Design a protein around this ligand. Structure first.
Ligand SMILES: CC1(C)C(=O)N(c2ccc(SC(F)(F)F)cc2)C(=O)N1Cc1c[nH]c2ncccc12
Ligand code: NI
Ligand code: NI
Ligand code: NI
Length: 274
């Protein structure tokens, strides 16, 4: 079951404007919520819906997954603003990131060390907060980073393929969709997901920033990426890559998870030369 709480909003307060994409449990909308925030009468929102076709078990799964976000207070993680458990459809309301995901943003720029370093620090800020709170993201990638009106980068999750980035995922038959080009050697081999496997992924995100979001390991198939990465292979230095940004990547791609820096260590090294 699920017990309604202080996060509950009256369905009458949410109007739905247009659709943004598909989503795991149903349709995702851009909308407006009324008195959901202090000193702000209306708020532009993202609405995640449970498909009306979905079962009882899966409506409660959805609510209990999204309740994890009630614990979070980091301006660098997309913020939950409210739930609607009562009646149909079942909604969760969230901060609207008006400039979309970081991969689309990067591809549309088809920047300086300072902008790349800023974007990196903001990403490392949300991930440090999540990892400290026992939250291992498991799909950290530019496509899951969101960009606000003010150009702030936040950690989100725009499910797992929206079709748009369907080449980013490998179907391991029955298993499911794996983002293999972002996965650490211990994740690929043993299904080990830790803070250290999030740090590996962050290195791939830095490579995505430096290449304006090229596909990692372009011209290797999904199975060749597995073999290459498990046997100690590394992405090449992006063209025009500043030294500092590539040193950070390499730190993140130590084969032994224990030799990688923590997100806190990454924020320190970034701040020390800002
Ligand atoms: C699908 C949805 C709403 C969601 O549920 N999440 C999410 C956020 C945080 C966490 S917690 C984590 F640790 F993963 F970040 C888990 C899911 C997102 O990021 N979404 C996309 C999204 C939000 N705002 C937007 N503005 C414009 C376009 C798309 C979006
Ligand atoms: Ni399920
Ligand atoms: Ni900040
Ligand atoms: Ni297609």
């Amino acid at each position: 079951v699920y017990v309604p709480d202080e996060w509950e909003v009256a369905r009458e307060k949410i109007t739905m404007s247009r659709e943004l994409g598909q989503g795991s449990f149903g349709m995702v909308y851009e909308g407006v919520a009324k008195g959901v925030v202090k000193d702000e009468p209306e708020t532009r929102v993202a609405i995640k819906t449970v498909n009306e076709a979905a079962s009882m078990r899966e409506r409660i799964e959805f609510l209990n997954e999204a309740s994890v976000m009630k614990e979070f207070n980091c301006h660098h993680v997309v913020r939950l603003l409210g739930v609607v458990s009562q009646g149909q459809p079942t909604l969760v309301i969230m901060e609207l990131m008006t400039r979309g995901d970081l991969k689309s943003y990067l591809r549309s720029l088809r920047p300086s060390l300072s902008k790349m370093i800023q974007m990196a620090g903001e990403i490392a800020d949300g991930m440090a907060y999540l990892n400290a709170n026992k939250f291992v993201h498991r799909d950290l990638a530019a496509r899951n980073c969101m960009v606000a009106e003010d150009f702030t980068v936040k950690i989100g999750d725009f499910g797992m393929t929206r079709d748009i980035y369907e080449t980013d995922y490998y179907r391991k038959g029955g298993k499911g969709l794996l983002p293999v080009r972002w996965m650490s050697p211990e994740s690929l081999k043993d299904g080990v997901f830790t803070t250290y496997s999030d740090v590996w992924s962050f290195g791939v995100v830095l490579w995505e920033i430096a290449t304006l979001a090229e596909q990692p390991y372009q011209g290797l198939s999904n199975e060749q990426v597995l073999r290459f990465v498990m046997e100690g292979g590394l992405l090449d230095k992006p063209d025009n890559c500043p030294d500092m940004l590539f040193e950070l990547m390499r730190m993140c791609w130590q084969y032994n998870p224990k030799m990688r820096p923590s997100f806190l260590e990454i924020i320190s090294s970034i701040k020390e030369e800002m």
